[PDB]
Write a protein that binds this DNA or RNA. Structure first.
Ligand SMILES: [K+]
Ligand SMILES: [Mg+2]
Ligand SMILES: [Mg+2]
Ligand SMILES: [Mg+2]
Ligand SMILES: [Mg+2]
Ligand SMILES: [Mg+2]
Ligand SMILES: [Mg+2]
Ligand SMILES: [Mg+2]
Ligand SMILES: [Mg+2]
Ligand SMILES: [Mg+2]
Ligand SMILES: [Mg+2]
Ligand SMILES: [Mg+2]
Ligand SMILES: [Mg+2]
Ligand SMILES: [Mg+2]
Ligand SMILES: [Mg+2]
Ligand SMILES: [Mg+2]
Ligand SMILES: [Mg+2]
Ligand SMILES: [Mg+2]
Ligand SMILES: [Mg+2]
Ligand SMILES: [Mg+2]
Ligand SMILES: [Mg+2]
Ligand SMILES: [Mg+2]
Ligand SMILES: [Mg+2]
Ligand SMILES: [Mg+2]
Ligand SMILES: [Mg+2]
Ligand SMILES: [Mg+2]
Ligand SMILES: [Mg+2]
Ligand SMILES: [Mg+2]
Ligand SMILES: [Mg+2]
Ligand SMILES: [Mg+2]
Ligand SMILES: [Mg+2]
Ligand SMILES: [Mg+2]
Ligand SMILES: [Mg+2]
Ligand SMILES: [Mg+2]
Ligand SMILES: [Mg+2]
Ligand SMILES: [Mg+2]
Ligand SMILES: [Mg+2]
Ligand SMILES: [Mg+2]
Ligand SMILES: [Mg+2]
Ligand SMILES: [Mg+2]
Ligand SMILES: [Mg+2]
Ligand SMILES: [Mg+2]
Ligand SMILES: [Mg+2]
Ligand SMILES: [Mg+2]
Ligand SMILES: [Mg+2]
Ligand SMILES: [Mg+2]
Ligand code: NA
Ligand code: NA
Lengths: 144, 208, 49, 53
RNA sequence: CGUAAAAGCUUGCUUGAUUAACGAUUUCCAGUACGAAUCGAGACUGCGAAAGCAAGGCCAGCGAUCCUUUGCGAAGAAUA
RNA sequence: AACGUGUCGCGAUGGAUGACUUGGCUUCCUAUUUCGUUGAAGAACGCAGUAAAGUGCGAUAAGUGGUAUCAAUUGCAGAACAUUC
RNA sequence: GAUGUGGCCUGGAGGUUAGGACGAAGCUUAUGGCGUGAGCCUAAGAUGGACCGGCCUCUAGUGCAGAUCUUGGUUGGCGUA
RNA sequence: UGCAAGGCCGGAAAGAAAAGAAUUAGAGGCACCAAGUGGGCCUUCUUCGGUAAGCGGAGCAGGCGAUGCGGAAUGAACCGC
RNA sequence: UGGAAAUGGGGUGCCCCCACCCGUCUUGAAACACGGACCAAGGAGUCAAACAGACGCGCAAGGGAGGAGAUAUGCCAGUACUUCUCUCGUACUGAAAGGGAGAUGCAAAAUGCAUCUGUGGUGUGCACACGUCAAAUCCGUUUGAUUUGCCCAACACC
RNA sequence: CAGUGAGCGGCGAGCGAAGAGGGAACGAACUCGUUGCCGAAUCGGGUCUUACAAGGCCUUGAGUUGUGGCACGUGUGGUUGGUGCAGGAGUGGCGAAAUUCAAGCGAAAAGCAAACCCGUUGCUGAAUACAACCCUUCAUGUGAGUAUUGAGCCAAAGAAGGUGUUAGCCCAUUGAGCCAUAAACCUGAGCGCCUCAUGAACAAGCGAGUAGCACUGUUUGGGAAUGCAGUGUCAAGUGGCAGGUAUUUGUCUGCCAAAGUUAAAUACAGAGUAGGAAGACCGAUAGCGAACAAGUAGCGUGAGCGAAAGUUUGAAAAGCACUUUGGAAAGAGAGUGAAAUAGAACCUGAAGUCGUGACAAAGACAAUGGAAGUACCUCCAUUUCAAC
């Protein structure tokens, strides 16, 4: 809304907060990102370290679908299990089955302590996650 | 001063703004509700014109490509000649009773072919065909009562007679097996990955 | 309250002993000169106060 | 939940009882309120003296 | 400025002018970089009977992005 | 004294303001929707009882024919199928 | 130079509450009253002739003394050269 | 059972005496966002160049700039405030 | 009870005192520095996109579209409804091939074993709980200190 | 997807896409050349059937230096041609309710009875008005009721325009429904007859100055070269092209260039024709340059440039007859009108500047300005006027 701006407050001040000495001119320091190495070097170096240069190998025709690979941790597994099935689950009995690729995950990582044992179908798994789930009483079965 | 801000890349250095000397290059959406109304009206009029035929023709079920959409299903362009032959239909005849035909799809496995043949069989079972001459009815054509008792399918994707796409069912809860409790799966997966990853170097080292 | 993204962004990331995140949309853009010893110099990770 | 609006329920109130005057005047609060003390007398119409000597 | 059985002169033996896991700091200073300098840990050494001394000649003598160009990823072994 | 100054009542010159709006600008929709050698677009000259501009028209020239309607047009002349000439 | 204001004023919108041929808007003032102030209100017209005020929200082409500023009108020099 | 380092247990503690033996219009610490400015000039003490300058260049502090008021008849900077 | 008196406003003149022309650049303007005959109407920090901070509102390990469709809907460019999906986030790191984060106890295995009501440790740290001591008291209690326990947010060292 | 952990770039300023996914649309597919089998079965022109028939007959006219066809007994055709007959849509005309109800004029054609009810009831009047210093006499003055009050009707119509002030019931508009139609459009691919067509009985090949390669130039995000152009050079044979880092050699996957036609979903960023619907926009120095005889008047040799200006009197011209002074323009009277202070480009009629009458004074301190008094005035406000 125009009625909340500083122009309304500045009607009658003759300078609009830009000073009598310096004044408000067109482009006092160049346009855009000009002078990044010459007269804006301190700003670029202290706030954006690493702006200039090259690094690494090139990948000409990048396709992200073959690289798709989301992850989920061991202590977050209760997000994919219904409440009643989670309640009726204990070591040695029947366990719920979780399908990761139908929920949008590819790899199972092993952070934290698992809350409810289950059988997990995943494309990838880590060493620690596999060991911890087997010790806790669940299982991991590979899928594609 | 400038301070700590993001380095901007706003990409507006061409003559896009219409002014006293430039025509500009812009696109606005101020006609969106009017066009929505027009499209719905046209669909209703077309359905009335082609009554009692279904508004949308029958289409098959296909699997999405790539490893990201491997688990999804959707509708394809048309049925393959192999599927049509398995169902017992000439493609040219099938093109005249509201079935789409696509001669490019390959049918590289039996499961999708079976599901499409099932769709075709259901459609043919539910089809009602009007005679060319009601005074002289022939085989495979409906009677006067069946012709009189007819309705139109106005579903968005058609498929009012075959249902939506079918997804595989979920697995029921079970118990862990002794093999699953004993075996380590990371070692299995890693060995299989390395077998392909180091194939060339292993073969070259063997050839020495 | 600590652990917010704004708190993680507060400060200048180009001075010795600083570990704040820069304001950037492209994650792979602000590497190289000033962040690697091979590219001129590297921002020092530690400084006595 | 609503049958029409999928997964919608009425918002929970921030206050169980919105009558705060009754709470402020209840016996339970008055039991713990601080006692009222006697104040000094109101100043008279005559001006008070300020000259010690 | 400092230095007298030396830091000067002579002589004998040597290559600490090497490498040094991204350790810390001083000077300029925005407490940024460059140049120069100080205190260290590890390897292999030199001189000395030994305690020790030495990673140049104390303190001026020098150089970013991009580009070009050189050196280390020695041979052997893993059923992974 | 005169000229000149100041305030008030009235009056000139001047054309602001308010109210009004058959105009502009902007945004949508519908379709049997797209000129010309069978001579187009544009340019010129003419035409009324009275007629400079403008509008309409072309020596059949402020217009002929047909269908519908139903008594005017009007500054002034003039004319006068209503069953609709 | 920064910020605040149940701080003032202008054109339009959603609400609510009023006024007007027993005279709306506009215009005039040795018409007073109120407010530190931006301003608000009343009186008179020997003015005018048809619309419009307050309050809460919304909105913007929203406040002029000077830019050798723009357009229109006027003016001393002057009954002079 | 010596020295060095990190801890645990226990004690004492004019909470800092007396000899001139402090005082405070004495709440400490930590952040985020952003403006204007980046031509200065004068005076007191100390000064460098110059014959000198209402000249050029510096150190400490106070001022004008951005500020009136009361004094020196008059004066940006003097005296008082 | 009047052509009344009184007190405030308003107007014009006069006396004693006070008092350099506005706007601007400038260290310094009243200036022999520039713009300035009068009046009316007009006249200059706006709209869009990317990012960040402060403040308001909804939901929360999840938040939210957009495009489009469906029928109330055939007055209505609005409102009411909807799925998958897409996007930001719950995990980062390496040039890359790749890999990927709990605690305690026993112990010391080149993927060790066992339990799952749980701040990894230390120092400084609101409120609350247990005591004690002062000052004041209308004798009901208040205002300050401090001991111990747990310490929330937060800071420092590991 | 994506301002991209792609990529291009004095790797600076800057630039910058594609596959996949959710959707719109979609009865979407066909024709030559070549190969195999036929070989004038083809085209044009005359003439006849209601006929320049997708028809019959005749034609050396064209064409074998290759037109054209076929494979890779019940029915049907309204897109063969000739004759006819329907209904519908569309188009054009016609076509709805309810008060000019009662009260009369300067002052009651106005009010009060403080949520609702009392109330289909009670009570009235601070206008004996005003008209310019005050007081007496005589005059003169109020446009049109869509206003107020009291009763009563219509609504499947309350929807905005007109009418002398603000109108559901003064006028127009709008609904059901009625009438009339060149062709075209839609309807068991609407329905008959003649003619003509037709469904259905009885193997080898696949587009050559092309693709590719070299040099040069340009273009692209395309980077040992994304597309294209000029010249040189110039192929293969089921083998060829594409798989985003150059070369040689093996596999694998997809597809088959160098000929052609084709609706819808999309644009209309200074077009046009015939119709419509709107706006938190502008309100005559604004909005298009143009609300008007506006691309006009006017300017320039020319290409071109390009205004100003609401005729807004009044309800209605009722637009000032007549007397008189003047050569006339006009003045003084009279009259119309509610108003002439509405007299003709005439609503309102500001600021600035000027004339006139009354008054205040005033040396030469340029004038203006501040602070505090006083003299004189005051169509201003408030207070008081009796043991107050
Ligand atoms: K026919
Ligand atoms: Mg400012
Ligand atoms: Mg500046
Ligand atoms: Mg600065
Ligand atoms: Mg965190
Ligand atoms: Mg370091
Ligand atoms: Mg260095
Ligand atoms: Mg060493
Ligand atoms: Mg170098
Ligand atoms: Mg090796
Ligand atoms: Mg003729
Ligand atoms: Mg406006
Ligand atoms: Mg005046
Ligand atoms: Mg403006
Ligand atoms: Mg003005
Ligand atoms: Mg003492
Ligand atoms: Mg400057
Ligand atoms: Mg100087
Ligand atoms: Mg200054
Ligand atoms: Mg002073
Ligand atoms: Mg003197
Ligand atoms: Mg002055
Ligand atoms: Mg100067
Ligand atoms: Mg000045
Ligand atoms: Mg001077
Ligand atoms: Mg100048
Ligand atoms: Mg999500
Ligand atoms: Mg699903
Ligand atoms: Mg993160
Ligand atoms: Mg990665
Ligand atoms: Mg690495
Ligand atoms: Mg993104
Ligand atoms: Mg470009
Ligand atoms: Mg052939
Ligand atoms: Mg042929
Ligand atoms: Mg009547
Ligand atoms: Mg009306
Ligand atoms: Mg080919
Ligand atoms: Mg070629
Ligand atoms: Mg280019
Ligand atoms: Mg084409
Ligand atoms: Mg005008
Ligand atoms: Mg105009
Ligand atoms: Mg008038
Ligand atoms: Mg007038
Ligand atoms: Mg005037
Ligand atoms: Na700027
Ligand atoms: Na009428």
């Amino acid at each position: 809304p125009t009625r909340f701006k500083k122009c309304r407050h500045q009607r009658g001040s003759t300078f609009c907060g830009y000073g009598r000495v310096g004044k408000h001119r067109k482009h006092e320091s160049g346009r855009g990102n000009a002078g990044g190495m010459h007269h804006h070097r301190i700003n670029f170096d202290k706030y954006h370290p690493g702006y200039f240069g090259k690094l690494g190998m090139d990948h000409y025709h990048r396709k992200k679908n073959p690289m798709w690979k989301p992850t989920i941790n061991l202590n977050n597994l209760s997000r994919l299990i219904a409440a009643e099935e989670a309640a009726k689950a204990a070591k040695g009995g029947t366990l719920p089955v979780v399908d990761l690729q139908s929920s949008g995950y590819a790899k199972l990582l092993g952070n934290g302590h698992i809350q409810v044992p289950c059988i997990v179908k995943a494309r990838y798994v880590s060493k620690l996650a596999d060991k911890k789930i087997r010790k806790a009483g669940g299982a991991v079965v590979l899928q594609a | 001063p400038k301070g700590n801000n993001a380095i901007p890349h706003v990409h507006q250095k061409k003559h896009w703004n219409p002014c006293s000397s430039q025509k500009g290059n812009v696109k606005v959406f101020l006609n969106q509700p009017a066009q929505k109304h027009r499209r719905r009206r046209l669909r209703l009029l077309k359905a009335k014109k082609v009554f009692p035929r279904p508004l949308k023709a029958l289409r098959p079920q296909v699997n999405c490509p790539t490893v990201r959409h491997n688990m999804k299903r959707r509708l394809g362009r048309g049925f393959s000649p192999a599927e049509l032959k398995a169902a017992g239909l000439n493609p040219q005849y099938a093109a005249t009773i509201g079935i789409r035909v696509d001669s490019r799809r390959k049918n590289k496995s039996e499961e999708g072919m079976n599901v499409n043949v099932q769709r075709l069989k259901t459609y043919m079972s539910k089809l009602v065909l009007f005679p060319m001459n009601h005074k002289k009815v022939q085989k495979g054509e409906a009677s006067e009562e069946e012709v009189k008792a007819a309705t139109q399918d106005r579903s968005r994707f058609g498929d009012a007679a075959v249902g939506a796409v079918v997804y595989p069912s979920a697995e029921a809860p079970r118990a862990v097996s002794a093999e699953e409790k004993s075996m380590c799966v990371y070692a299995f997966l890693k060995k299989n990955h390395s077998a392909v990853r180091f194939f060339g170097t292993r073969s070259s080292r063997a050839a020495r | 309250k600590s652990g917010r993204e704004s708190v993680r962004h507060f400060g200048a990331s180009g001075v010795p002993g600083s570990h704040s995140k820069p304001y950037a949309t492209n994650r792979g853009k602000e590497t190289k000169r000033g962040r690697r010893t091979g590219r001129s110099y590297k921002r020092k990770a530690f400084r006595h106060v | 939940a609503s049958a029409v609006k999928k997964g919608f329920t009425l918002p929970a109130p921030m206050l169980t009882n919105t009558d705060v005057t009754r709470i402020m005047q209840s016996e339970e609060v008055r039991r713990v309120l601080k006692p009222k003390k006697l104040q000094a007398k109101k100043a008279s119409r005559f001006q008070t003296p300020t000259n010690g000597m």
